[PDB]
Structure formats: C-alpha cells, structure tokens
Design a protein around this ligand. Structure first.
Ligand code: ZN
Lengths: 155, 84, 141, 291, 49, 368, 84, 330, 144, 54, 122
RNA sequence: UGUAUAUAGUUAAAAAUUAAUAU
C-alpha cells in the first residue's frame, strides 16, 4: 500500500510533473488484459494494493483477480487445454500501460488509451501466447521479460 | 567463498607479527631475493581479549637464569637496571 | 519546548530581484538553447500554425531491443520557438494502441523530424476525433 | 603498480554496477548533516562514536581506566613499559579519531640502533608468517650483525631472541646425549633437601613414564661432600649444570633442563651443528583442543 | 506528610591538635578535659585569673 | 548509522604491543623505543625492569627502518610514518574551503549525452568577495571567512551596515554570509571570488529561504488526513485530531500543528553541479529549489559523500585557496561558447530503461 | 556520574554545590543561584586568581566514612519522634 | 485501525546525543568503566587510616622514610646502629649483615675514612658468626670499590680463590666497577670481564668486545655518589613519612597491591622460604599464570567505609622529643 | 527534486516572487491587458478590492471608471485606488488604440454611452505624447 | 545461560566446567558444551545503577 | 533556565577567561625562555609548540587497522595566508571536470613481491 | 560456490521520492 502524505512536499500530483509523479493505482482498477487468451478483459480487476511503472512492476508481483468478462466465445469438451481462465481465478498479472501520463526520466511522458495487462501464472510464466498491444519501457526487466519473451515491441 | 567477510581483519601489530617482505619465486635486482613464498595467517590467538596485559620479556639468553648483579641496592645487568 | 520555523535574517530575507537587470536572463536562455541546437539535440522551430499537425517519425533510441520508430501526427507545438520547452505531443497510434506522448524536444535520444504541408486544420481534426474515440472507449467497461 | 579502484569497464564486465555518489534515493550516508554543530572536517566519521555530537571537547579530565587520560602518573607494570606517559589520551568512547591542535610542529627525529657500528653491513635473515612456529628461523634475530655474533663461542649468527615458554612434564631426550646425576651419599638429610630433590629427578627421569632413554642416565655416588650435581651434555659436548637453588625439586629440574634444552639446541644450531628431528612436541603446536 | 526540615544544621567538629603532651590528650569522655581542644593561636594572651 | 561507526579502538589498549609500526617513546629530547628511565633512581618502583637495550624490540625495529630503504617500492605508503603532511597543500581530510553566495535566476531542462532529463536551476553568482576574516578568540576549528555579494549602492544599505564595508575597503556588498574554513584555506580581505571555485562534478550544499506560504493549516503544513467528504463529519474536514493523549493534560511539545509553513532556512545537502558559465558567473544545478527567484542561496561544499571524502585523489582536487584566474585570461574577450563547462555523466545508465544488468539482451530473449 | 565526568568534571562538582545550596535556599529563585555563582571550579590547579590571593582553606574532612547515594525525591514519612 | 504514517519508536524527548546517545545499550555498555581508576576512589582521610590498618609504623626521618619512589628505606648511620644492636640477635640471618654494608655505601663514598671501619667490623664479625661466604665478600668488595680503595678490591678478590670461593658472577662486577671509578683505564676492567666469560661465571651473548661495552655503559650510568653524572650521583630523596598513595600497585590489578599488611607479609615470606610443592621455583615458566583480570571485581565492605581502625603503633617515647636541629640528605 | 518541490498547486502569499518552476498550471505574472476582470493579489492581476461578488466588484469597477471619465477626479477609497489607476491607464490604452473593436470593448464596460463618446476624443489629444502612468494617485490625509 | 536462581545451586557438570568471576557474579564457564552447561549466579546486571536496579 | 544551562551561562565566560589567561601567560613563558636555556621539561619543550606523534597507526583488539589523524595548524602559516595573494590556479585543475561516481577500492598486492600487510584473508 | 540433497553471508542498482539554522 504505497502511500504519500499530502503536505505540499509529499504529494502525488497528477503525473505530468516529473518522474515519481503520482497515483499508484489502488486495489481494484479493472484492467484490460491483452494476452491471446480467454480473458476478454472488458474487465480484469486488480487485487494488489499498488500498481505503476515508477512503482516498478519490477519488484512487487502484483496479484490480480479476473473480474472476468471471461470470453468472446469458446466451446468443446468439459476440460480442455488450460488457457481458458475460470471466472474468478487469481493471477499475478503484468501491467503494460496506463491511461495516466507516465513521465519518465527522459521527459517523455506517455499516456495510453487503455490501461492493459497480460495474465501471468503464479510463477510469472505468461498464460498467453501472443500480445495484441504495446507495452511501455517498464518491461524489459529480467523480472518478467525472461518469461515475457518480447511477445511484441515496445513504446 | 568461506566467511564472506573478505578482508575483515587486515591487521597485525608490529609486535606479534614477524616480518615484512616475502616473494614467491622471482628476485627483484638485489642479487639476494630468496625470501619465502610465504603464507598469510591469523594473528596470535584471540588478540587481547584473553590477555590484555603482558609482562616485559627480556632476550631469551638474558631471560633464563637472570643473574643477580647489583650495585648499591640496584640490579645492573648488561642491559637492564632495576631497584631491587 | 519551541522552534523558530521562520528565518528572517538580513541574508535570507533580502532579495536580488532589484539588481537582476544586470543579468540578461533570456539572452542566456537563447544561448543556452543555442548550445543544444549545436550539439544536434535540437533543430530550430519558428511555427505557430503550420505545426499544429505534421508527421513526425520518432526515433527514441531506447536501448530496449532497438530504436522505436512511430509514425505520428503532432498536435501540441508547446513552445513556438527554439527555446528549451519544445513539446510536440505527437499522437503516434503505434500499431493498434493510441499513445498521446509528448517529446521534450531537447533530448538526444528522443529525436524526430516533422514535415510541413500536412499541417491541415482538417488532418488535425482527423486525428483528434481518432483520439477522442479512443479515449472514450478505453475505460474497460 | 596497479590501480587501487576498479574501472568502469572492469566493474561493468563482472555484471556489477557503479555505486552512486549522486542523486540516488539511498541514504547517502552523511551523519553530521544536522548534528555536528561547528566546522566539520572531511574526515568521514570522526565524531560518531562520541555520540555524533561535537559538544564538550574542552575538558581534559575523563574517566580513565588503566592506561588512559590521567593514569599516566601511576605505576602500572604494563602501561609503565607499554605507553609513554605523554601520549595517554582521553576516555574510552571519547577516543580521538581526529585531534586538531594549534602551534608549531616539532617532529623529533627517529631513534637509531644501539651497539651497532655505522655502515656495518649485516647479513639479512628473512622471516615471515609461513614458517610454522617449529621453524628455527622464527625465534631468532632478523638482521644478523657481526657485532652480536659471539665468537668466543663458535657462532655463525647472533643467537635467538625469543624462546617458547611451556611447561615440560617429562625429561625427553630433546638434544642431550648424557644426563649424569652425581651425589655423595656421605652427605645426608631427612626431609626435602637438595639430596632428595636430585635423587627423585633420577627416579623421575628413570620413570617408566618419561620417554627419556633409561640407559643414558648415569648415577654417580661421590665421596668428597659434593653437593648433588646434575650434569647434562648436549650433542656438541657443552655440559650444563642446572643450579640447584634451595627448595627446588623434580618438576623444576625437569623444567630447567628441558627449557634450557631449547636454548642449548639453539646454540648448537648456531655454531653449524646439523640438528635431528625431535619426536615429542612439548610446545603444543600441531594440536587443537577438541571435545 | 510534612514539610522538609530546611533549618541550618550545625557543622561537625574540627580535628583536635596532635597530642605531643603525653597527658592522655586523646581521651574524650574524661573528667579533667573539657571536650573542646582549642589551643589555637594567641590564646596564651588570653591569660585568665 | 551502522556502517557509519568507524573502527573502534579503545584508548586503554593503544600501547606498544598494538602499534602497527614501531612504537616510539619520546624522552622530551629524542624519540626512543624504550621508556624513559627516571633519573632519580629512588623514583623507580621495585621489580620494574627499566629497559636500556631490549634485543627483541631493537631487532624488530632494525628490520623496519632498514627494510624501508632496501625495498622502497613495497613500503611507499609507510612513509607517512616519519614524513608527515605539511600544513597547507590541501590536506585531503582537513582542508575546508569556503562557499560563495548565489542567486536563483531561472530554471531549465538539460539532458546528458544520455537522455536523462535534469530540471536545472541556474544560480547567478553576482559579485563574491571576501569582506572580513573572523575567528573566535583565535581558537582552533572556529575560523570563519565572510563573503560579500551583489555590489550595491551605498544607499541601499542602512548607514550602520554600509559603514562596515566602507571600513573593510571592499565595495559595499548587498549581502554577506560566514563560512567556516580551516586556517590553511584563508585568503586576503578583498579577494574577488569567481564561479570556477566550484568544479563541474562537485557536490555543493545550498542554503536559502524556502518560499513563504503564509499561515497554512495543518493539512498543508504537515500531512494530516481527516474528514470524509460526504460521509458525515459535521465540521471536521481539516481540523487536527486529538491533541494530547487523554490524561497527560499537557499537549506534548510538538504535536506538530497548524503553523506558518515554510519561510525558513532550508538546506539541500549533496546536490551535484551541472554546468558553469564562467563568463556569465552562472552555475546550474540539476534540481528544483523552492525559493522565490532572487533568493540569496549560499553554496558550501558537501564534505563527505557515502563515507568517502569529496576532494580525494581519485575524484578531483580543488583549486585549494580559491580559483584565481590567470593574468593573460579575462572574460571580456570570449563568449558564452567558450565560457561553458559541463559535468561527467551523473547517472551510470539512461534512466528511462534499467541498468544494463536488468535489461536483457536477445541472447537470453532467445531463451530456448 | 562518570558519563557526566566525560563531559565536564567541573559539572560533577557543580551538581553537588547546587545540592547543598538547594539544601536550604530553594524557596526563592534569587538565593537559589546567587551563591552558586560565587564558587570557581577548576579541573586543574592553574587559575587566574593569583591576583586575588585565595587564602587556603584550613579544613580536614570530618567524616572518614564513605558517601551513601540518597535519591533526591526520597521521602521520610515518620521520624523517631518522642510521641510514639 | 492500522498503518501509521510514522513507523518506528524514535522517542520524543531523549535527543541530546551527549547525555543520551542513540547507541544501543548492548553496544554502548562495553564502555562503562567497571575498572575505573583515575578519578580515584580512596580519599585522603584513609591514606593514614589504611597505613596503620596494616600494622605499619611511622618512623622519624633518621631511622627511615618512604622515599620518592614510595619504597621504604633505612638511613645509613641508622643502619649501622641496628647492626650495632642486633648483631647478637638470633634472628639476624646471613643476608641481614650484607644489607647493612650496602646501606653503608652512600656514606663510605662520602665518609671514606670514618665509615670504612664499620664495613670491616661488619666484615670481621660476619666471619665469626658465619664462616665465610660470597655475600660478605661481594658486598665488602663493592664497599671497597666505592671507598675508591681499588687496591682493597684486589686485596679482597684474591682471597676468594684463597678461600676456594670461586669469584662469583658479581665478584667480577664489583671489580669491574672498582677498576673504573678508581680512575684506572680500561684493560684493567676489560681484562677482568674477559676472565669471567671464559670461566662461564658471567655470560655474554654478543661478540665479547661489545658486551663489555654494554656492561660499562651501565657502570657509567651508575656513576659514583660524589660525581655528578648518573643515577647514584643524584642525592635528592623524597622525604615522606608515609607513601602518598597507600593503594599503589606493582602489578596489574588492585589485588596486586604494593603495601601488604605485616600479618600477611609474614605468611608470604614463609611460603617463599619453605618447600614449593605447587609452584615451581627458579625457572622462567611460573606455573601460577597471572590472571588478575579474571579475578573478583567489586567493591567490598572495605571499599566504601574505608579501612578498619587499628590504633597507631606509637611510642610513649620518654626520650624528650627535642627537635633540636634540622637534619636532611644524609 | 525531479518533480517540483511543491507540486502542481499551492498559494504562496501576498509578497512572494514568481519562483518559476516546471508546471502544468498557467500563471500570467504580467498584466498588460486592458480593462480586465482579473482581480487578485497575484502579479498578473490588479488588486482585488473588497466587494460582495466578482460580479458586484465589476459593477463597482464600472461606476468608478465612468465617474473618473465624467469628471477627471474621483476620490476613491482604499484598495480601489491601486485598482483604479490601472483602469485609467487601460481606458487610455483603450482610447488610444481607436479601432472600433476597442471603442466597444469600452462600450461594454461603461454604464453610460456619452462617456465612451468622450473618452475617445479628449484622451488621444491629451495623452498623445504620454505613454504610461496616466493616473496620479495622491493620498488624502484624513482617513474616512 | 540459565541463571541458577541462588548461587548455591551451581554445580560443575563437566571436567572443563569451572568457576569464574564474571563481574562480581560467580558463574560457571566451560570450553566444552560452551552454553549447554553454562550457569550464571543471579545478581544485578554488570553495569547497574542506584535508581534502576536498586 | 535549566540546571545545565545555568552552569554554562555562568561558566561560559569563566572558561574563556581561563584559557585567555593561559595564553596571556603563555606569552610570559615565551619571554623568560628567550634568554633562558634551550628548553626545560615545562610541559613539553616550552615554546608554543606541538610535538609530533609517531604513534598513530594501531591495529585494534578486533584486528582492524585504526589510524589516528592529528593535524597541527601553524599560527605563522595561516597569517601568511591572510596577507599574500594565492597563486593562479593550475589550468589542469579547473579545466578538468571532477569525476562523479567514486569507484570501489580494488585489492592488490603491490608488485611481484607479495608483502601487502593485511596478514591475509583469502 | 562454501556446506548437501539443497545451497548461504559485506555490498550495489532499482523500488517505498524528498531534503530544513531563533538573536
Ligand atoms: Zn559441562
């Protein structure tokens, strides 16, 4: 639960004001996963008490629920090749981008359209094959990349 | 990779050490540089926590059977003087 | 117990704003921004319109894999002159994503060459609606 | 002539990273940032142990255990010969990791060697840690002059300086060759006398416990009221009579002759006599106490 | 409880002069000697009749 | 503060059998290995071997002073035993130069060769001159050098103030502050300090009056929570909580409280230096200070940074008394092109990406 | 008391005068301290008062016994008190 | 009801860093001096109470006086007056007599005629009680050296062989010292030292040329009483009737004290003069390993109230206490 | 540090420097604008004298300007004076420009039309050669 | 090291178990079984004071 | 005013008057040693001097190197600062930028001779 | 890697983003 303390010195601001800007994405923020899985991620609720890039996905392994929107459409036998997320499972998701101005130490501050993620297993092995979105430079850390093999290119 | 401390002691007194210069197989110029190829050890057992005080030790041949050679109530040795 | 919390000595309370005309502040910031267009970090701009839209090809030499090249459609023009601010705010629509990101324009790794003649008050509105429709339908609902 | 710091390339190779002295989030250790009130010197940590203050600093008296501030005017058999009464410094935790004084410096010159004629080129014997304490090259002079070489005795080098100091139970043949014990039974005495102290030394030597060769000890009844003599002869033939001071007894003589045995075997090793391997190690050196 | 007693307690006695009389100048509770042994200085001037 | 406590050496055991080198007893006249034998022989205690030639000491000491000459290459660092550092010369652990008064002038964003953006506040050093040298009763460690600033009409100062500068001989300076120096870092009254007195890679300590904010309440002065927005809270949106505990009756000194919120003397300890326009007397720091433009801010040096001296051998040695530019050199000729100094790269790696250790090359990307 | 002696040995003495001047004169603040500022504490003999000629103090300690440490804040609540 | 913004137990008031340093008492306690010595813990009232509480006595200067080194001495011409009185005593042993002669030296070098008969009367009588030994021979030879009567030193030395007594290891130094201070060149002391090395009575571990120097450079450090170069050439003595510090030590620890109660000095001189079945004797090993640190360390009953009170050993002293001079420095 | 030490928004004080810092917010720190409803104690704002509402304050800015033009003196009280003299240097900055944009930008502001008929005639003749500080703020002595 | 509640309970279990005056407190210290058989008499801490531990 | 604050607000101008005394006497001793003999004991050698301490490099009880720093500022050298002009700074100092990033120490034996004085650690 | 069925230990980078002097 990374907090700050509004005291004209400690203050999140809004982004758009330098590195270590603000708003670490409290507990449940309904991410929009982008792996090539059952997750249809009109919702995938967040469950860890923080999220950000300056807050560094590198360290925390932010547990995330899946407030599923749970498919576009699937079918077959009762039990199949497990990539099809159950409507209530929990996964250490990997946040890709944000809808918030994420300043970096290069002054480049990116604001994306939808704040997305990729479901990952308990062991940080991505539960998805491909990725249908970009991903800020906060990936490429050996934390997840060694399993997040560069499913695609970055921004 | 024993005891990660790694240069944790780096210290031996001028006393209680022995001497200064070793070398492995080579010589510098001095035409006599056959020194040791020496070893790098632990200082005298636990340094002074055990024995904080030491009594004055004379040279060995001056130590054993220290003769009693006095002048007027003082002991004159070839090296030491003391009021007996 | 107690504490001062306000130091009003003559050294702290006095202000040099009076004597400040001795310094040509901006004529330093000119030359300050002049020593950054010389190193190649930045290339001059004199544009108020004719830059509200264009076509930058960003080359953020991010050491991540390799330089990222994003065709973009500038929509800020933050400063209107060669000074330190810069600020293009290119839209840049990477492949499927929409990423309103603004380049500080002084950065040696974050280089970009815009081309005029498309600075159309139409083509600008072409993308604004494209990012207005992308903004709205991205809240995950 | 190396470089005392790693280089960036050297540091980068191993996979490590350069330590920031910079805007890093880390502590950037700088205690004395607000506590040390006054001029603070660029010696990193010279006021921490005191308590990270600079407060009092003017008093010269400090609670001094033996060998500290004002103890210098008392006789403590150790600090009498181990600290010049001048340099005695402040209390324990009030150590002087940095003492700044005002005045003109006077650097007194170093002392020179005594009883050494100038320019006399000495032969150099090099010692070091490597030598296990058994090594004869360990307990003797390092710089061997022609001045400290006894010539009235045959010596190739000045004799040893330091001698091992341990208690000897048994009279093992360290380097002696014949231990004769002369008494005159015409002299008599009941109770602990020198007659008794020397004759048990015969028994204590001839004991089935001491590894002394029983056939190499010679008793000798005298006649002319010869006080009990104990004569040991080393390989070089120089005889040695441990002085039988009154009140002596077995464990002293077995201690005298064995302790001197290391000195005398040293003198034999100085004249040039080759020495043998000794079985017993009265000085525990290859031993550790186990449980 | 009560107030602490902040009066002025009298001070303890000085040491008497050394003996050098052999008259048992040391004895304290004897009939001859008044307690006080004050042979101070120009006391011989205080010659009493 | 662990890792800050230096090697602990008890005074009771800094004696002969400890000294890393041969311990030297002084006799008042000359050093000698042995204790002084008191001349009144009665003064000797019984059974105290008054040593006059100890074959164990003298030979251990014979092996020191001889071997230092025989094999000099090895024992070079042991020459600070008898060859002490002279006074002056910028002793590494001792000397402390003064600082120079400054003025916040503007702010700019500046980047390295790498794309690290630094919000750079550029301080103008208008006219810095030594106005008076002080002391405290001529004691040690209590020597202070005072530095003027900002040449100013004699009218703008009160007559009692300006009558001081007029006495010292310096042109009347707008403001002056006192820096503690070690006596070997003095200069003559009337030295005109120049900005190059700092080195582009240094770390300076700045002190100023952080911008006044009035009389701000407690949710601004400090960080206080408090008050649900629409969930009750009759009149409690920002008021503090319980002052005392309950029964102390004595509101504990420092609770913090509402207050005057920041017109005080603030300090940044170890901000490094970025550039130096020694033609403009500008010095750029990669930070943002919270002071109104024109806030006179004094610049000492940062003394020791992470247990290591700032001005050591491997990391730059300063212009010791102060940088005095050469006689052939003047600034009226050159231009801002030539008057610009820059720093080493403060950050090891481009900071938007991670260190080369965490970023992974394609070799492991092709994990297989 | 020793950790107070590191800081200033004269303070160890001043703490005790205060305890004998505040043995009767605690009542009003003017006579609590005005005596204290009449004594001059010197951790060594050298002192600027040869110009005042301090006459020595002919006084030998009276109590050969040692000093008990009695807590300030020790309350006696009943005395030997003939009326028991 | 959790997650405080202000973690930690940084106390409120105790911040001065001089009277409460932020150092864990686990790591700070190791400086509390539990053997604290300089701010001494023995007032001056006791220094005399603990004197008599040993059985010690205060003698007038002429008999003796604790000298500058707090070592009790006997004044010559008060030493002889003992030997005049107690020579017949049954408890006046061998080494008592020679000790008289040694005390008669700082006068036999100052009064070489009036005190050279006392030496001989100690000599002549010593032989009548104890047959003939080296103590009396080394002593009187040393006395004859200081009298600057070198011929007497030679006239004594040649009687060692005449009595079979092999000249002791000192009997050369008593002679080496004589041939030096009597104004005779070297090769009259050298030829004596070279005698000693051959007979092994003296031992020299160095080339024989330099040991003899180290010998004389101690025998001129000890210059004669009437000269003005050396330690014996000093006449200043600390006149003190009692040592200024009755608890001084001569070892390492308070229980290694210097001044010992008569009633324990006796039970010491006993064990050093009996069989030694626990500690070996005449050897540099000393089985009884000194460990005056691992011994008791705590203030007893007699560290607070001070020493007991045993009445001063003092004389009714009928002899008249007359003060009728000032005597000093022999 | 990298972000401003005091983040996006905080009110410094009356009598405080600009202390420019990288920020998203917009501050004028300059008030060359004529006939402007920017009342405040900042730099780019003329002094906000007290009134019931920024509207009613603007209504006081009307009848105190149209009465300075009508008769060239108005004995105004308190923080209205430093707030009026800047409105007398604006009316002349409005009366000098002359274009029919300005003559309305004052017509919107004056309660009466004859004034905007006066201000544009006398002031170009009057202040043809004065270029700033058209209003003299001399303080009367007896406080109300 | 189990404080043997009175001094008198102290017993030397091992050959190497001896007594020691660890700062006025009679204790038992053994090289072997170093803390296994160690006993320490009950008494005030080595550095107490008159207001803290009476 | 507290107790400890009192003792100093009383003894602060009583210690200054004490040390200013000794110095004022230190000038007196500095006089009668001009015509007098070379030097007595007299608290050292009795000019206004500071003897040098060759005894500053210790190996503590824990076997770790402890160096004593002693600096003796010369009253004649410091005044020789406050009058003369300092020399023009060497261009190899300021025209060079001070390195930011002090790198860690690397151990090393000096030359082909393994002297190195740490005793070890392996 | 030491150790043994798995494997330690000074540190460094990053992260939790902020600096504080009454006469
Ligand atoms: Zn046991």
């Amino acid at each position: 639960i990374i907090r700050r303390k509004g005291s004209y010195r400690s203050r999140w601001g809004n982004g758009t004001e330098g590195y270590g800007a603000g708003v670490p994405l409290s507990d449940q923020v309904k991410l929009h996963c982008v792996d090539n899985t059952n997750c249809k991620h009109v919702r995938l609720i967040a469950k860890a008490t923080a999220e950000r890039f300056a807050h560094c996905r590198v360290f925390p392994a932010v547990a995330h629920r899946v407030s599923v929107q749970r498919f576009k459409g699937r079918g077959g036998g009762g039990e199949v090749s497990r990539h099809r997320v159950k409507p209530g499972n929990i996964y250490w998701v990997c946040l890709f981008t944000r809808r918030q101005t994420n300043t970096r130490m290069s002054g480049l501050q990116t604001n994306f359209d939808r704040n997305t993620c990729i479901i990952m297993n308990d062991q940080r092995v991505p539960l998805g094959t491909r990725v249908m979105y970009c991903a800020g430079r906060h990936v490429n850390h050996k934390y997840h990349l060694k399993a997040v093999v560069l499913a695609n290119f970055f921004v | 990779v024993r005891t990660e401390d790694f240069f944790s002691k780096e210290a031996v007194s001028h006393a209680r050490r022995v001497s200064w210069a070793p070398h492995t197989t080579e010589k510098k110029v001095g035409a006599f540089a056959k020194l040791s190829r020496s070893n790098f050890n632990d200082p005298l057992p636990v340094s002074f926590q055990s024995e904080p005080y030491f009594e004055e030790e004379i040279e060995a041949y001056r130590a054993h059977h220290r003769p009693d050679v006095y002048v007027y109530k003082y002991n004159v040795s070839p090296t030491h003087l003391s009021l007996r | 117990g107690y504490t001062r919390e306000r130091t009003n000595r003559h050294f702290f309370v006095s202000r040099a704003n009076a004597f400040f005309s001795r310094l040509p502040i901006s004529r330093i910031q000119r030359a300050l921004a002049m020593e950054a267009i010389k190193k190649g970090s930045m290339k001059p701009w004199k544009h108020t319109k004719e830059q509200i839209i264009g076509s930058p090809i960003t080359c953020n030499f991010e050491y991540n894999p390799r330089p990222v090249r994003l065709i973009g459609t500038v929509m800020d023009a933050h400063t209107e002159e060669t000074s330190i601010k810069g600020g293009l705010k290119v839209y840049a629509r990477s492949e499927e994503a929409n990423m309103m990101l603004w380049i500080p324009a002084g950065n040696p790794k974050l280089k970009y060459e815009v081309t005029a003649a498309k600075g159309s008050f139409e083509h600008y509105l072409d993308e604004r609606s494209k990012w207005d429709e992308a903004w709205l339908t991205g809240r995950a609902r | 002539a190396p470089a005392s710091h790693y280089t960036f390339a050297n540091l980068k190779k191993l996979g490590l990273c350069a330590p920031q002295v910079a805007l890093s989030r880390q502590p950037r250790l700088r205690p004395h940032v607000g506590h040390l009130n006054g001029l603070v010197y660029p010696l990193p940590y010279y006021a921490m142990w005191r308590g990270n203050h600079d407060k009092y600093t003017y008093n010269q008296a400090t609670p001094a255990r033996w060998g500290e501030g004002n103890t210098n005017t008392m006789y403590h058999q150790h600090y009498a010969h181990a600290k010049c009464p001048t340099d005695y410094g402040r209390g324990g935790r009030e150590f002087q990791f940095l003492s700044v004084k005002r005045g003109k410096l006077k650097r007194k010159p170093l002392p020179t060697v005594q009883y050494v004629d100038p320019n006399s080129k000495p032969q150099w014997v090099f010692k070091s840690w490597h030598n296990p304490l058994s090594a004869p090259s360990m307990w003797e002079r390092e710089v061997q002059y022609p001045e400290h070489t006894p010539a009235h005795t045959g010596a190739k080098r000045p004799l040893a300086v330091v001698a091992p100091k341990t208690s000897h139970k048994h009279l093992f043949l360290m380097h002696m060759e014949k231990v004769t014990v002369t008494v005159s039974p015409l002299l008599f005495g009941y109770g602990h006398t020198l007659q008794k102290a020397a004759l048990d030394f015969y028994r204590r030597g001839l004991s089935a416990r001491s590894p002394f060769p029983s056939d190499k000890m010679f008793l000798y009844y005298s006649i002319d009221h010869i006080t009990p003599k104990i004569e040991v002869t080393w390989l070089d033939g120089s005889v040695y009579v441990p002085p039988l001071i009154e009140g002596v007894k077995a464990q002293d003589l077995i201690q005298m002759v064995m302790e001197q045995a290391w000195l005398a075997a040293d003198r034999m090793s100085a004249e040039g006599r080759v020495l043998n391997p000794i079985a017993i190690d009265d000085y525990k050196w290859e031993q550790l106490i186990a449980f | 409880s009560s107030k602490k007693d902040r009066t002025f307690k009298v001070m303890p006695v000085p040491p008497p002069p050394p003996a050098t009389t052999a008259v048992e100048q040391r004895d304290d509770f004897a009939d001859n000697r008044g307690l006080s042994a004050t042979t101070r200085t120009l006391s011989p001037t205080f010659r009493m009749f | 503060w662990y890792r800050c406590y230096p090697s602990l050496m008890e005074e009771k055991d800094r004696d002969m059998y400890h000294c890393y080198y041969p311990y030297l007893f002084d006799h008042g006249d000359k050093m000698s290995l042995y204790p002084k034998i008191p001349d009144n022989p009665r003064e000797w205690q019984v059974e105290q071997l008054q040593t006059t030639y100890d074959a164990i000491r003298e030979d251990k000491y014979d092996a020191f002073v001889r071997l230092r000459a025989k094999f000099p290459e090895l024992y070079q660092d042991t020459y600070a035993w008898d060859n002490p550092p002279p006074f002056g010369e910028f002793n590494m652990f001792y000397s402390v130069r003064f600082g120079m008064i400054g003025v916040k002038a503007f702010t700019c964003k500046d980047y390295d060769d790498l794309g690290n953006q630094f919000d750079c506040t550029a301080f103008w050093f208008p006219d810095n001159q030594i106005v008076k040298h002080s002391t405290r009763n001529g004691d040690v460690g209590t020597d202070k050098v005072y530095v003027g600033a900002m040449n100013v009409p004699v009218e703008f100062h009160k007559p009692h103030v300006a009558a001081f500068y007029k006495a010292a001989g310096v042109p009347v300076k707008h403001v002056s502050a006192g820096f503690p120096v070690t006596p070997d870092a003095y200069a003559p009254v009337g030295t005109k300090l120049d900005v190059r007195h700092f080195k582009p890679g240094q770390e300076v300590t700045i002190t100023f009056q952080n911008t006044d904010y009035g009389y701000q309440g407690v949710m601004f002065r400090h960080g206080f929570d408090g008050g649900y927005v629409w969930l009750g809270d009759s009149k409690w949106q920002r008021r503090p909580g319980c002052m005392g505990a309950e029964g102390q009756k004595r509101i504990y000194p420092g609770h913090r409280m509402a207050g005057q919120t920041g017109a005080s003397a603030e300090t940044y300890d170890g901000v490094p230096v970025w550039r130096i326009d020694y033609k403009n007397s500008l010095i750029y720091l990669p930070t943002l200070i919270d002071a109104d433009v024109g806030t006179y801010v004094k610049f000492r040096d940062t003394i020791n940074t992470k247990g290591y001296t700032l001005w050591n051998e491997h990391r730059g040695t300063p212009p010791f008394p102060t940088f005095i530019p050469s006689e052939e050199e003047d600034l009226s000729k050159l231009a801002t092109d030539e008057g610009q100094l820059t720093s080493p790269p403060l950050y090891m790696y481009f900071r938007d990406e991670f260190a080369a250790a965490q970023l992974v090359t394609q070799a492991d990307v092709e994990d297989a | 008391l020793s950790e107070m002696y590191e800081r200033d040995p004269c303070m160890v003495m001043w703490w005790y005068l205060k305890d004998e001047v505040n043995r009767h004169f605690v009542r009003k603040l003017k006579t609590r301290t005005a005596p204290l500022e009449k004594a001059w504490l010197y951790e060594d003999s050298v002192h600027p008062h040869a110009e005042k000629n301090p006459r020595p103090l002919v006084w030998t300690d009276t109590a050969t016994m040692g000093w008990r440490y009695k807590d300030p804040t020790f309350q006696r609540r009943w005395s030997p008190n003939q009326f028991m | 009801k959790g997650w405080t913004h202000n973690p930690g137990h940084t106390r409120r008031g105790g911040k001065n860093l001089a009277w409460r340093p932020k150092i864990s008492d686990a790591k700070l306690s190791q400086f509390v001096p539990l053997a604290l010595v300089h701010p001494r813990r023995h007032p001056n009232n006791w220094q005399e109470r603990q004197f008599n509480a040993l059985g010690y006595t205060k003698w007038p200067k002429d008999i003796g006086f604790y000298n500058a080194g707090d070592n009790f001495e006997v004044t010559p011409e008060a030493a002889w007056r003992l030997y005049v009185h107690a020579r017949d005593e049954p408890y006046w042993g061998k080494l008592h007599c020679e000790k008289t002669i040694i005390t008669l030296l700082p006068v036999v070098e100052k009064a070489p005629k009036e005190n050279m008969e006392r030496v001989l009367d100690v000599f002549r009588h010593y032989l009548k009680r104890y047959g003939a030994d080296h103590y009396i021979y080394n002593a009187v030879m040393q006395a004859a050296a200081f009298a600057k009567n070198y011929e007497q030193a030679e006239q004594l030395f040649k009687e060692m062989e005449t009595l079979g007594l092999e000249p002791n290891a000192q009997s050369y130094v008593n002679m080496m010292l004589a041939a030096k201070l009597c104004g005779l060149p070297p090769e009259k002391s050298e030829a004596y030292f070279k005698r000693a090395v051959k007979d092994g009575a003296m031992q020299s571990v160095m080339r024989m040329d330099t040991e003899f120097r180290m010998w004389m450079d101690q025998l001129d450090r000890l210059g004669s009483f009437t000269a003005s170069s050396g330690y014996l050439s000093v006449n200043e003595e600390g006149a003190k009737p009692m040592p200024r510090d009755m608890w001084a030590i001569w070892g390492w620890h308070r229980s290694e004290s210097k001044f010992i109660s008569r009633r324990d000095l006796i039970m010491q001189q006993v064990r050093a003069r009996v069989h030694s079945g626990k500690e070996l004797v005449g050897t540099v090993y000393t089985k009884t390993r000194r460990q005056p640190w691992a011994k008791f360390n705590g203030m007893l009953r007699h560290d607070y109230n001070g020493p007991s009170y045993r009445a001063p050993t003092i004389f009714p002293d009928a002899p008249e206490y007359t003060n009728e001079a000032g005597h000093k420095a022999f | 540090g990298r972000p401003p030490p005091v983040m996006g928004h905080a009110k410094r004080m009356r009598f405080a420097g600009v202390d420019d810092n990288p920020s998203v917010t917009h501050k004028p720190w300059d008030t060359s604008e004529p006939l402007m409803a920017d009342y405040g104690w900042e730099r780019g704002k003329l002094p906000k004298f007290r009134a019931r509402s920024p509207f009613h304050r603007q209504q006081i800015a009307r009848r105190m300007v149209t009465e300075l033009i009508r008769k060239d003196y108005v004995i105004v009280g308190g923080a209205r004076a430093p707030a009026l003299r800047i409105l007398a240097d604006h009316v002349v900055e409005l009366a000098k420009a002359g274009d029919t944009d300005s003559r309305q930008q004052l017509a919107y502001f004056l309660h009466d039309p004859l004034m905007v008929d006066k201000a544009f005639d006398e002031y170009p003749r009057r202040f043809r050669d004065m270029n700033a500080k058209y209003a003299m703020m001399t303080r009367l002595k007896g406080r109300r | 090291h189990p404080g043997l509640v009175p001094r008198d309970k102290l017993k030397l279990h091992c050959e190497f178990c001896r007594f020691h005056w660890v700062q006025d407190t009679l204790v038992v210290r053994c090289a072997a079984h170093p803390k296994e058989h160690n006993q320490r008499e009950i008494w005030l801490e080595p550095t107490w004071t008159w207001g803290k531990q009476q | 005013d507290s107790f400890k604050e009192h003792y100093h607000r009383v003894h602060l101008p009583r210690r200054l008057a004490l040390q200013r005394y000794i110095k004022r006497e230190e000038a007196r001793l500095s006089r009668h040693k001009g015509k007098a003999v070379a030097a007595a004991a007299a608290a050292g050698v009795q000019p206004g001097e500071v003897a040098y301490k060759y005894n500053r490099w210790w190996v503590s009880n824990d076997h770790e190197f402890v160096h004593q720093f002693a600096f003796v500022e010369d009253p004649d050298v410091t005044r020789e600062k406050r009058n003369t002009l300092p020399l023009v700074t060497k261009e190899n100092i300021w025209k060079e930028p001070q390195q930011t990033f002090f790198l860690p120490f690397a151990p090393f034996v000096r030359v082909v001779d393994y002297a190195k004085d740490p005793d070890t650690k392996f």
